Design a protein around this ligand. Structure first.
Ligand code: HEM
Ligand code: HEM
Ligand SMILES: CCOC(=O)N1CCC(Nc2cc(C)ccn2)CC1
Ligand SMILES: CCOC(=O)N1CCC(Nc2cc(C)ccn2)CC1
Ligand SMILES: C[C@H](O)[C@H](O)[C@@H]1CNc2nc(N)[nH]c(=O)c2N1
Ligand SMILES: C[C@H](O)[C@H](O)[C@H]1CNc2nc(N)[nH]c(=O)c2N1
Ligand SMILES: [Zn+2]
Lengths: 421, 421
């Protein structure tokens, strides 16, 4: 009836029953396990050129309404029954339906709660929701986004929020933001063959240039927002500088560290995912939380395909960077990460270290099993990129599965966009 | 016809077709992925009470023979034909078959090559095979094991080897080593409830005591070998102290490190797995390689359920152990691991750091794809437990699947053994 889950670090067990409600979209079979694929198509939700048949939609809608009313501490049969009725008639007389403000709030929080790859879910109930479903132009989208950025940045005391643009209709009037993130630095391929800035963003930066943006050829240039309104061709908008809070990096001991002249933005915001709820699809729903130190210290600064600064920090510390077995790399990554946490704290900007994040997630996980007999979780994304087994999550067996509402991936907009002009 | 595999660090791609030959036995469904389960039933070959029926044996046996002869650089069709006949008649006139000497060698190396959770596979063709299939008593087992240990230790210049005991017959005459490993330290529960030694080895040490072993209540006492021959009750044998090479731990910069008085054995040997080949089952086949440093530094020394010395080392270093955010745990694990590598090196005992291991695995995986369009790999076990994303394997997408020959887990012998005396 269930799958038994064990934590080898404490001996604790959990019984997972919630997985039975999961959708059958994972590409794993008895023949092979595909769990480690980065962007599996099973987690992606591509474009459409026609509306969702009322046929397929009605069940999901009812299913969602039931999920929503069931969550109430006290049944409300009348309201529940009446809502089930309203939704049915609406789907028949219009071909789709509209969620109420309260249902949208519930949905965005539940989709977060159902995100397997997110270690910060213990905060799932503290989420600000900006209802931008009546948005109609690209410039209006830009204004909602600036409001979101200002609200969440909050002078360094970061707050989580999501802005929801209009739901998908026939799939030809999609409202979305092409950028993978709201704030991101440019990457440029220089005339001399070198790469300046974030090497993983060269392709998108080039797209911006081709759309008219003026490359500033700097190391930390914030790219503009490429906004798509009502299925129209995308329009560029630059975020005002005063809204982009940045933290300059320093090390509490190595004074030469500031000489590297490094910095990073304080707001981590995913802008290109799709919210699925009761059969409804929202292709435009940027959301943000706050940073976990290792995202910047380990991935952005130390990935070879990113800023790749590990060797330089190594030399400056005076390590034997010619001998792998000296573990100079491991010593350097810890110092770089210490600098990230120190710099954020020094400037009073919210950030979280990976130990604290791992611990809070274990608490969250335990509450989810006692509250709903399950917690979808993707071990591969939850274990931090450094000091894995030193954290409690490493020793925790987990089940990964897709529920609904859910945040899905999408295919980059520029790959499937049919340019009108 | 093929799954595309990608390395996000180098952008390189792989096309996997080998997974088609895989045995459909993983518990992963379309509704939920069970990739992070430690010891799944799908990778466990339990006991038997009756010989294996030829309807299953014959097909598998032909498969193996076909696989073995296919592996030849210059086909030998006649011999291949002869073998198929011989094996068929043999299975007919006796009910089972015997592998030849070279088929056994081939089988052990292929099973290693097929081990998804082993990062040291680049050395797969370099394996000493001790053929102990004509063994009949527990005492002979002991002597075969001492020879194996002496050969493999080789005064610090560790060599890989496997010792193969008699194949399973009716499942009531199993030849096996009850110990999880050939060399392991005891764990004692004291009268007050506290634990002395390896707390993860408390149950097995108690079993040894109940069978007659005199406890020494030390922190690093090597437990005796519990050996079962021909399905009989197990016999205890203590490994001669001179055959157990140990490395005393020291730190290159911290003189106080030696005051912790820590050491570890040089030979990592798995002794409780089952080798499956052509339908045949070998429940007794201890094998060894050489250590990867993180195994001792991170897992044995820093796991909270193991020796758990992290906090003590942090204090000695004078770190702020009251603040998770100072990342003292990360600084301390690095120092402990530097000590492990330094100590082995100083005593001239083969050991391998996790960076070199990771790099060699990438080479091996590349060759595997060029050789057979596949490489079963379990991401979760291959990424080292510290500095994960700083190694190339973290960025490599992988497919996990079960081939044949293969090394399976077994149910602990003491849980299923029916005592005669
Ligand atoms: C409150 C602070 C939060 C923290 C500390 C946190 C932390 C994280 C981290 C570290 C990741 C891994 C990112 C990566 O490796 O690329 C992640 C992923 C994710 N988070 Fe959270 N998160 C927070 C808030 C949120 C919010 C507000 C939502 C949605 C309402 C959310 C939805 C997700 C999703 C769907 C992913 C997966 C992104 C992907 O697969 O590319 N998170 N989060
Ligand atoms: C020569 C050097 C070798 C190295 C450095 C190496 C390294 C490793 C490591 C680091 C693990 C993970 C162990 C754990 O996390 O518990 C492992 C597992 C394993 N190794 Fe290798 N190994 C070597 C040789 C061998 C040989 C000779 C065989 C087989 C004949 C082998 C078979 C396996 C198997 C089957 C596992 C999985 C064990 C389990 O699931 O408990 N290894 N090895
Ligand atoms: C490579 C560029 O990466 C990024 O811009 N980011 C890294 C990936 C992603 N991280 C996040 C997202 C959220 C919502 C909360 C915490 N962390 C968004 C920020
Ligand atoms: C907790 C006790 O752990 C162990 O005795 N070991 C850890 C797990 C296992 N490691 C290995 C095995 C081999 C064959 C090669 C390298 N490393 C065998 C040794
Ligand atoms: C729960 C999870 O399966 C377990 O804690 C881990 C993960 N990674 C591992 N990988 C290795 N090399 N060795 C292990 O024992 C484990 N165990
Ligand atoms: C290849 C591998 O699956 C991939 O690089 C992963 C692993 N774990 C991850 N986990 C997180 N949190 N974020 C990531 O992008 C990745 N990338
Ligand atoms: Zn799977």
């Amino acid at each position: 009836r269930h799958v038994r889950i064990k934590n080898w670090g404490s001996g604790m067990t959990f019984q997972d029953t919630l997985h039975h409600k999961a959708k059958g979209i994972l590409t794993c079979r008895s023949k092979s396990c595909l769990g480690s694929i980065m962007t599996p198509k099973s987690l992606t939700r591509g474009p459409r050129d026609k509306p969702t048949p009322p046929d397929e939609l009605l069940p999901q809608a009812i299913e969602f309404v039931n999920q929503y009313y069931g969550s109430f501490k006290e049944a409300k049969i009348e309201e529940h029954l009446a809502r089930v009725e309203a939704v049915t008639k609406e789907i028949e007389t219009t071909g789709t339906y509209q969620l109420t403000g309260d249902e949208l709030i519930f949905a965005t929080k539940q989709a977060w709660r159902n995100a397997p790859r997110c270690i910060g879910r213990i905060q799932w109930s503290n989420l600000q929701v900006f209802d931008a479903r009546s948005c109609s132009t690209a410039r209006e989208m830009f204004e909602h986004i600036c409001r979101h950025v200002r609200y969440s940045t909050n002078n360094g005391n970061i707050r989580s929020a999501i802005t929801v643009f209009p739901q998908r209709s026939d799939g030809k009037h999609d409202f979305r933001v092409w950028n993978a993130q709201l704030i991101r630095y440019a990457g440029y391929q220089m005339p001399d063959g070198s790469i300046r800035g974030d090497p993983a963003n060269v392709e998108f930066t080039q797209l911006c240039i081709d759309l008219g943006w003026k490359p500033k050829y700097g190391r930390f240039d914030v790219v503009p927002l490429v906004l798509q309104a009502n299925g129209r061709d995308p329009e560029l908008f630059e975020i005002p500088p005063d809204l982009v809070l940045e933290v300059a990096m320093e090390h509490p001991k190595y004074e030469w560290f500031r000489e590297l002249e490094l910095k990073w933005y304080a707001l981590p915001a995913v802008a290109n995912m799709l919210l699925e709820v009761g059969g409804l699809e929202f292709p435009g729903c940027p959301f943000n939380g706050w940073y976990m130190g290792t995202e910047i210290g380990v991935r952005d600064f130390c990935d070879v395909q990113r800023y790749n600064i590990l060797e330089e920090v190594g030399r400056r510390m005076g390590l034997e960077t010619h001998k792998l077995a000296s573990l100079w790399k491991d010593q350097a990554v810890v110092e770089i990460n210490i600098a990230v946490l120190h710099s954020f704290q020094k400037q009073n900007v919210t950030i979280m270290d990976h130990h604290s994040a791992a611990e809070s997630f274990m608490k969250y996980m335990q509450n989810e099993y006692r509250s709903r007999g399950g917690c979808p979780a993707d071990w591969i994304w939850l274990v931090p990129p450094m000091s894995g087994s030193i954290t409690p999550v490493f020793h925790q067996e987990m089940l990964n599965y897709v529920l609904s509402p859910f945040y899905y991936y999408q295919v980059e907009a520029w790959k499937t966009h049919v340019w009108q002009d």
